[PDB]
């Protein structure tokens, strides 16, 4: 078939997908903070 790209499903998927990776990145960085 001739499927589209930007769809409603896509939006959702990114609202959770995008932030997540951004956090996993943030957290991964914390593993090195100290005192």
For tokens 């409603």, what's the residue? 8
Q: What is the token pair recorded at 14? A: 């990114």
User: Is 33 assigned to a binding site?
Assistant: no
6 is a contact residue toward another protein (CB under 8 A): no
25 is a contact residue toward another protein (CB under 8 A): yes
Residue 10 and residue 26: Cα distance in Å, rounded?
24
Residue 1 and residue 21: Cα distance in Å, rounded?
31
# residues contacting another protein (CB under 8 A): 25
Residue list for the binding site for heme: 14
| Residue ranges in contact with another protein by CB under 8 A | 3-5, 7-10, 12, 15-16, 18-19, 21-30, 33-35
């Amino acid at each position: 078939v001739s499927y589209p790209i930007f769809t409603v499903r896509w939006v959702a998927v990114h609202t959770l997908a995008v932030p997540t990776i951004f956090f996993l990145g943030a957290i991964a960085a914390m593993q090195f903070i100290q005192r």
